[PDB]
Nucleic acid binder design. Sequence first.
DNA 1: TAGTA
DNA 2: AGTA
Lengths: 614, 637
Amino acid sequence: KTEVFLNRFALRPLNPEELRPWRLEVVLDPPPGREEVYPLLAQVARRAGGVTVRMGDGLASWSPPEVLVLEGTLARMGQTYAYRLYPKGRRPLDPKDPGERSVLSALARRLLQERLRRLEGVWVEGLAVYRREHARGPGWRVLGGAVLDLWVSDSGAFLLEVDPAYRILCEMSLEAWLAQGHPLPKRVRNAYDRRTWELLRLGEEDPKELPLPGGLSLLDYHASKGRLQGREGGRVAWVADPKDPRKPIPHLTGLLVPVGSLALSLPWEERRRRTREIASWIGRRLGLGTPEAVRAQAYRLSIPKLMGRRAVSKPADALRVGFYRAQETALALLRLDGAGWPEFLRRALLRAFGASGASLRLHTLHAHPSQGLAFREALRKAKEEGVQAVLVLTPPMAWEDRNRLKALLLREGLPSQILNVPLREEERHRWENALLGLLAKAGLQVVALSGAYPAELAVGFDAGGRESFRFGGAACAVGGDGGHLLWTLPRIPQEVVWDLLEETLWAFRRKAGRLPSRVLLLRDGRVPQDEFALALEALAREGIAYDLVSVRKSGGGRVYPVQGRLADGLYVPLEDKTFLLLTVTPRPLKLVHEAGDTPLEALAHQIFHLTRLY
Amino acid sequence: HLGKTEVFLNRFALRPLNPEELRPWRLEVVLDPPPGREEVYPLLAQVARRAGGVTVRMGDGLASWSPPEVLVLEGTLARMGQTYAYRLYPKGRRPLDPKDPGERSVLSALARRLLQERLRRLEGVWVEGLAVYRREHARGPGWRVLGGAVLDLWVSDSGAFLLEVDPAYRILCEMSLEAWLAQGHPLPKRVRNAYDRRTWELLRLGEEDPKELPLPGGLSLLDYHASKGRLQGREGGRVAWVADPKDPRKPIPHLTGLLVPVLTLEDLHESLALSLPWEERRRRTREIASWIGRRLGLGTPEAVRAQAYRLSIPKLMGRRAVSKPADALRVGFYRAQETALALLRLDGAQGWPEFLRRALLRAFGASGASLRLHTLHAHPSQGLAFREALRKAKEEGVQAVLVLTPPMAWEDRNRLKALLLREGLPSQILNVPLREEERHRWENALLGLLAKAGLQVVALSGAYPAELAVGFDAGGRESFRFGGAACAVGGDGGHLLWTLPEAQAGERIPQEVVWDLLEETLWAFRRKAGRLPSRVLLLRDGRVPQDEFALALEALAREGIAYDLVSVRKSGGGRVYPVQGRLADGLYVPLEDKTFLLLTVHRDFRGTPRPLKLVHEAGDTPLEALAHQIFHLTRLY
DNA sequence: TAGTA
DNA sequence: AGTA
């Protein structure tokens, strides 16, 4: 038990009016698919006045009825709907009932933006305000500020989050900037709004003879909107959406905007000071009481004992000291670039196996996926020759492409590890890990974790980066202390999540000759918790207990020590079954226990220990 | 069997197309806002219509036979809630050749549309698309049966109009679903919109008040139609929960006042003289043809007659020569092996049905081979335990499972087969209501079970084009993303397997599915025969567009594997009648350079047979050779 | 089949 | 909140 500072700040409690927002019913025309309703009301909230937000399938507003735009239209994905709001008088909400308070926070959050607008002599993009300018150049003008956020606490009061930030601003414009010449970037942005894209390559075609699906020209599309009012920037550029990147879509460099002395980033003490400042400065135009730094009781997590042949501090050092369990191994390499094995990889593997007195064979893959039958053939031969797992050096492939390859391998019963080829040696973190995986998948128990945890099976699900398992998905899973399992991949989202877990569960009944008593499921919060409904219902019919935990890297906030320094692994409890996890300024992991009858500390310890060994 | 037999098709030849119709007007279209690329074709079909006249979709534009001045060059559209605006750009006249499979398909679309336009302007007669219903046959309160014929009009590779005619009857309802139900008639299966021809699956009625039932975004269900002026002159009635039926699981609301029950022969009752004997059918199709012919103005209909060859019957043989596959069950299999079969009873009891145990015990006895008749005492697919009982069974040597189960949805059927095949257990379905004296169904089911078990029941004579033939199926679905199954036959009976797309991840490109299904069959064939097949026969369902096999074909080419891609359609094959005398069983009727019919009566059918239309799309093999192999594969299984 | 409710 |  220790005391810590969170980058939050309590403000005044909400008054009785704010706890009793106005509600509004909505009618749309034409009626959209029920799955589209919610994103649309959110849009309806913007169309309407300000400090108004979506509530249920209606709206909730903090501002007077006579200020909202009760009628109009909104366009979404090219389609246009007519909306109409209907007042129905104030409705009370409890800050204490997750649901209702989601609204209050949404309201709270919209307000901040509304208040952030009025502030002048400073520019605000969304919730990110910017005071002092950090640089100035022919096009770049790095400003200094912080990303903000405002919400409601279970107490029923305001809560401000503050965190120092940068912003590389380009006032040049793609074509121009690409014009007095620079190398095209990876991610670009438009000129008419805030939506960002990933630059795929550049337009070798004519932007007026290049027709979109309808048959409309790329130029006419934008021209007939007002975006071409003599803003000629008119070179063609092939862009792609941050979501689902091959489907590539055409755009215009002249209607885009890209993304040596140095303020990279300040220390901990400096940032926690710069943050405590803005809380005072922003508390100025906020007029919501006087900021109060939030103290949170943080618990000290136990450092786990790892065992290779001899004690070891990290799994990586097992590659020099030796593995916990050894066996005669055969590992083949598949190269999707050039040649044989890079020297430092052959070396370590030899070193590590020497140090374990185990025999090691190193094959090399005689084929490439593009030869059809031959490939499958090669894999079977290699599988026959004792190959127990495959290492794959390869240029960066799309999520979809690798899953596919691991499947051609998996069908020839070949576990695999994918090491991206522009191999950066000096990046040991990377390749030392790639090898641990390869070894774990080959069946080697590199390190043993001395334990005391509820889950004998922890499976983590992957959807790439999508907010859904619609387009198939993938799962990785370990048998508790040391038993990396047969990681899988697989229509309807619920049915997807379930097969993933069905197979893994099955792999484990294969190894342990018994079903796991309990399972720990880890997933990204970006995916609706409901997609797991079927898997959980399935686990129940089996009697398999479980705990469902949502994960989210960025968005945790910040943790600062009172006066000393922060320990290696920390556990910070929060508002209702939510808690932070901090390891080794650092970035916390925000976690949520959405289902399961297991204490948060137990869970915290098991995730942390799972984190310790990559 | 080599003799030729003249035969009359229910087709008729019309004047050749004049130069003008060989050079339709072409028009470029443009849509705003740009829709998803997968909506462009469905939308152009809509533009073709909005534009009016005899105009059809051609590529990414239109093609028309009516004067360009008659078209509606500008208008709006709506496709599933979403709406867009279109503008046409007349780009002159452009020639098409009947010899080219693609261009000919377009000219025929124009013809089909021509038939529609002429039918739509007919006096006192009833039209339901390409169908015409001329006269009454019975009526009674609110309903009325009409008899006419569904028709078709297309162009040939020769370049002349061809008219198809087949008598049909239609039962029309003269009132609303509200009226009909008010007067006591039962709940029909399917309902049609009153304001258009869209139909639906009626699920049930609802107690909710239309006036206050809210559609997704909040609009009342009543205001939805009310505003669309569909209410003018009607009564909304009560709420009717309806289904797509392409999305049979999701209910949408509707209203009885705006619905018209789609009546069936059952609904009416009151043995109502509706069924046409082959003789009466034939004279009626000639009579209607004469009729539509005068109204069509495309010359006089000359019934098309063709040469129908009787294909050579296959030298079938198990342990010794045989007249039919099921005979091997008692004379012994062509080539036996130790065999293990497990029976999975999803109906209600315990074992092997006495008559099934007998045939099997006897079949193997005649073959002189060891057999084990297992029984899965594992419950239906309920639990990871089931997955376990299966793994155990395969480990213990089972080679195939016989599933005795009540009829399954074909989704649930493919699921189960997927579970089992997983664990390496092939399968054969046999629907539960089974009775001793139903020799035809179960003797065959037993043959599939054995063929799948790796057991070669019967072998076909010899010398066929392909030594490996694989069929593809997407079950109704017009593409191989959403599902995909394939069955491979070792050519001359060496039965290979059954399978479907393994487990990969992410959106799937059809060409990759198709490729993988074949990819698997080749390995099956590999392991089971020692080498890759020299030539393969790929049979696909016509509903699907052949573009999806491109990757697959290029792969075979790369591999050094020859092929022939033939597409099958049990629909629109027309009819076939004798000119005189009666008609045999396995007939081969070639029609064009690359198309033929295949007929097969059996028992002695009083009705008329619907032949199978087959189209040779890729390949070098003669049609006759291809018809033999397919025909022989059909009987064998 | 051109066309949610 | 807002395809190209």
